[PDB]
Amino acid sequence: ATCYCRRGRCATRESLSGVCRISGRLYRLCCR
Amino acid sequence: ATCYCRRGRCATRESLSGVCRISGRLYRLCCR
């Protein structure tokens, strides 16, 4: 898989698969 | 599965399942 750490909702083909924390801040983990 | 984006190796109890990407950074995607 390749996932993207996003602050906005996941892309249309992505699934929310968890969270990332980067510089203290949570991001959506969006995977395909 | 519970997945984490890691700067180092995946935990012994996790599997390398891909990468996590944001602008400027790459991480291992590590899943259980």
XYZ file of C-alpha atoms in Angstrom:
64
model
C 0.000 0.000 0.000
C 0.743 3.657 -0.346
C -0.951 5.887 2.143
C -1.176 9.614 2.427
C -1.327 11.529 5.676
C -4.089 14.078 5.088
C -5.752 16.788 7.089
C -8.749 16.797 4.684
C -10.890 13.754 3.922
C -9.490 10.874 2.004
C -9.483 10.793 -1.794
C -12.284 9.106 -3.596
C -10.371 5.849 -4.144
C -8.731 5.907 -0.660
C -9.924 4.351 2.572
C -9.440 5.805 6.063
C -7.067 3.302 7.580
C -5.856 4.984 10.783
C -4.054 8.169 11.891
C -0.504 9.592 11.558
C 1.097 11.920 14.044
C 3.549 14.415 12.531
C 5.179 17.226 14.466
C 2.679 16.426 17.238
C -0.434 16.832 15.054
C -2.818 14.086 13.983
C -3.477 13.366 10.328
C -5.806 10.911 8.569
C -4.094 7.873 7.157
C -5.625 7.419 3.733
C -4.766 4.299 1.853
C -5.076 2.593 -1.398
C -5.547 -3.746 10.923
C -3.880 -1.173 13.113
C -1.338 0.714 11.070
C 1.267 3.272 12.028
C 3.540 5.493 10.042
C 7.042 5.053 11.397
C 10.339 6.860 11.056
C 12.301 3.717 11.942
C 11.779 0.052 11.365
C 8.439 -1.600 11.845
C 8.057 -3.269 15.212
C 8.884 -6.981 15.285
C 5.130 -7.567 15.739
C 4.262 -5.478 12.670
C 4.631 -6.052 8.943
C 5.988 -3.555 6.451
C 2.947 -2.873 4.326
C 4.055 0.100 2.236
C 4.843 3.768 2.761
C 3.157 6.852 4.164
C 3.592 10.133 2.286
C 3.059 13.798 2.988
C 4.693 16.735 1.348
C 8.364 16.664 2.369
C 8.343 13.338 4.271
C 8.197 9.573 3.731
C 7.602 6.915 6.455
C 7.198 3.175 6.618
C 3.665 1.940 6.853
C 3.661 -0.714 9.597
C 0.575 -2.869 10.239
C -0.798 -5.518 12.606
